[PDB]
Nucleic acid binder design. Sequence first.
RNA 1: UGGAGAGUUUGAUCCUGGCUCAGGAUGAACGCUGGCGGCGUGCCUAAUACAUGCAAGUCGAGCGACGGCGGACGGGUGAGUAACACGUGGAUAACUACCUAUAAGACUGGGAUAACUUCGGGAAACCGGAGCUAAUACCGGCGAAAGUGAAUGUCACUUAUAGAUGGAUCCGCGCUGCAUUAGCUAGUUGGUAAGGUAACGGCUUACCAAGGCAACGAUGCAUAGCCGACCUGAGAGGGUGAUCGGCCACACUGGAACUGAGACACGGUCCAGACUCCUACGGGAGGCAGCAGUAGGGAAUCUUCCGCAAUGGGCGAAAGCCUGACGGAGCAACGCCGCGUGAGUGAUGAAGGUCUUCGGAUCGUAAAACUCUGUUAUUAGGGAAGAACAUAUGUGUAAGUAACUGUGCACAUCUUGACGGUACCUAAUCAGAAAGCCACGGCUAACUACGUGCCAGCAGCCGCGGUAAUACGUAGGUGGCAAGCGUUAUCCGGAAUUAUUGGGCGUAAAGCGCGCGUAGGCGGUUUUUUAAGUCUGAUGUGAAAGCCCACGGCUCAACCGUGGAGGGUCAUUGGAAACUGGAAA
Lengths: 76, 136, 198, 76
Amino acid sequence: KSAIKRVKTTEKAEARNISQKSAMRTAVKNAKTAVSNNADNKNELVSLAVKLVDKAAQSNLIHSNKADRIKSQLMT
Amino acid sequence: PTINQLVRKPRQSKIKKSDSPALNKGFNSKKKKFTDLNSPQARGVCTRVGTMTPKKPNSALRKYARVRLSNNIEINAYIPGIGHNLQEHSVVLVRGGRVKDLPGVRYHIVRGALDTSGVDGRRQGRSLYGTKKPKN
Amino acid sequence: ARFRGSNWKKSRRLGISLSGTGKELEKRPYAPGQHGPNQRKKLSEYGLQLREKQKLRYLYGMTERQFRNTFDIAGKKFGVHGENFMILLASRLDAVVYSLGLARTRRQARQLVNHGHILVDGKRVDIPSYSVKPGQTISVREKSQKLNIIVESVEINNFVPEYLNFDADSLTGTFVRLPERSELPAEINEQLIVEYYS
Amino acid sequence: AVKIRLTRLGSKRNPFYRIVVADARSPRDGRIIEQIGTYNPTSANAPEIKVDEALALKWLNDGAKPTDTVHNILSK
RNA sequence: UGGAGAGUUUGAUCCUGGCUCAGGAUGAACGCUGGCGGCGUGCCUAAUACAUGCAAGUCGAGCGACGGCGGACGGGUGAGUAACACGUGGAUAACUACCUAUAAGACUGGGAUAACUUCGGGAAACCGGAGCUAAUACCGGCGAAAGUGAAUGUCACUUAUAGAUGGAUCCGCGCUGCAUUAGCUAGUUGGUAAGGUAACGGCUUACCAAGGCAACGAUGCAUAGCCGACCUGAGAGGGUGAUCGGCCACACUGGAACUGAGACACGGUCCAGACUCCUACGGGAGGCAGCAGUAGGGAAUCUUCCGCAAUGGGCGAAAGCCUGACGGAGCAACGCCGCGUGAGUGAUGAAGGUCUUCGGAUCGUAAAACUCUGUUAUUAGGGAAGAACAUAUGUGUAAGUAACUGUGCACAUCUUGACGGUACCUAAUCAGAAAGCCACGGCUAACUACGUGCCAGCAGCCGCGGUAAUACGUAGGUGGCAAGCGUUAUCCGGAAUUAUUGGGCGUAAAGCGCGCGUAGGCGGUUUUUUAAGUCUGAUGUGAAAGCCCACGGCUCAACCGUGGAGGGUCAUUGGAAACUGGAAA
Ligand SMILES: [Mg+2]
Ligand SMILES: [Mg+2]
């Protein structure tokens, strides 16, 4: 039973990505609201952070690395 | 016939049927093995001591055993040899092959491995009847 | 697998007077058993290829499985399946022993092979159905001179083939060429043999 | 990539090999890609080493992991 | 290279025509007998609940006192699915823990916490609390980045490359029975929209749009894993799907997920159902179609075996470690093969059986003796080539700075065999322990004398049985095969008895009661093209392994080894225009 210790990573690895993912998407869900206003204040310098979390489809690899371009392919 | 027609319908060949009906197929499943296939052999359980005759011109007497097989169905039989240590509801091995000039009997009760175990009275034709001689 | 029983029923009931189960005869007016000039003589139209199948099967002492397994060894030869079968029966190690005059029957030729007293090329061959390939010789072991039964064969010369070099007392031979017919046999056609197998 | 492999064949009390190469994902008995020639384990009435290095250099270019007792063939 | 027949309707024929036998097979059963050296295959019937054992770990040159790679490979099974499941050739809309080839850069700055002692509750599965801590763990700037250790070298991190490897996907063709089943789907067919996964996508949703499929078999039922191959056959074909390989699906039942490189995960996981069983009746545990063994329906299929030395696989830089993959043994004539139970010498028909004028024959040189032999074994032992290495250490390859490192490119030589006091082989009291089984009218190979005497029977058909009867039990005799002989159920040949190779319709089985007629099938003559069929050339491919065509060797042989032939009704790549076919007169 050496997959007992594999379970303890599995309830532990859910927390890191689902925090990163839910912060990836609400930074992006507010972004297309900010891209619906386009005042260059609530959209600038966090859209590349919305692309840094779409670059954290390579850092936070729970979203797959080759799947980095499934959302970020339109705004920038 | 014509090669045009042979394209439109092939030669659906002649079906044949088994000479001995009451064995060897997947029968009638009822959430258990309610009935099954016995390709060469089976068990039995007896129901009746049999005494009968041939019917064509012949006038002898024959001793069958009307049973119920291990798959709910009803067949006659025959004991080859001399001895009869059989009574009603005793286990009998089976093996196929009908008996001519008897009107409806079906198989042969194997005289070797059953309650039909061994038949004395025979000394030369032996392994057709299950009789031993450990000297030779 | 071996045929035993030296009674003349192999010669008299078949008919041929070969050197098999007893070279002599003593109950010459009769066949074996009550089968005789008294009783039934059962002949057939398929008994003319039966008795060219049964004529050889006791000669080497071989079973039924041996002939069919040797009938299609001649199929590897460029002749037909009935043409080189007698040649492969003439090339076995057993009938070359009796051809070298080192034993006194074809059956005594199978006794002195399996018991190690006759070898091939030094290496211990103990197979009566061993095929003598061309370019090989015949050997013995070091204990083959004390035995009276080889010296029995030194007393009497038995049989000379044409496909060998003939040494009846030196106990070593030479297979110079593949045989032909009427060297080992003398009486059998290659046409009544093959018809039994169809 | 691929790993250089000896397919064991042979009856009771008598092994025998054939030099093949495939990934470890493939098993020993089958799904083998190529064969650069046979290999002869027993040395009595039989050779002891057999290889053909023509199509062996085709697999050391794209990567190959010979087992450390197979490498004694190609060191000779 | 290779291809048989016989019997039976009549008082007697020729023909049509059925039924029946001889032969080959079985991961068969069962019937009698039993010597094995050696080789293989042993749940096919209730998908009947599964005790007890072992099958997934490894790393102490991470780092403390869990952080990594592996459990997606591997080993079991056929209930499902008539389908890109599989077979076979074409196509790009995109997918790698790995493996590697060069090159880049491998910086900067932080803070939360298991194990551990106290804390309380439960019988338990164990949990809520609090002080303690590193990490190569975690975070910030068509954009992230790691360091570690015996002699800086080494070894993983990280980005873009492209090669191998690995999966995915639509497409042409091959893919069972029925028409006493003719209609069929509705997000069904299509555009458009944005969302949606590695990508295309009715892929899932929204307004419009009137289509999909089909008598060339659409839809629906029952039966089924499928190929390479196995069986039989002159071949063409028929029937089969087991060990052995490739692909596929499934895990007591029915859904759904999570981590990671590419699982909807057999041994993990949350939930719901029918079952086993314990608890303090508050709750929790259990999934041997892994390796075997027991239980269960059965006429039917085995040891609860030590073990990693060889080949293969994870992890580590190495010793090594777990390996029911496997290297092998324990058991059944289960199949083929090879082999013995002996031969050389040995007339007076010796004792003696049923037949007989028993005036007599048969087995029968058989037996009784005489003579050699000891494959085999009733006596123990020296004792495999199968083991090449790895590790370094003997000094060699460059980074030799550094043969310590990845290698071990002098050897790899102080080293590695449960099985195995095996394979082999010598020497002994001994021819002494080691042979059946079915048949014997005709077929069909093999005959006699009585008992019973249309009876106990026997039977593949003709049938032999009303007072013996060559065709029933018995002894004698013979024939067959032989460590094996018969019987059964099943399949192919016999059966030219579904006939393309290879039949038939006046009376024998069979010509619609007959016209007009749609699709369809076939179409005279001429010349000229086209190459669609057809012809041949070229390439690539239809992988091992089997049958066959050959050979060192296991003392031959069964099996292994090397070569050889064996697939196309295919795609594509050139020549020819004779007929069948579109096109001009
Ligand atoms: Mg396993
Ligand atoms: Mg095994």
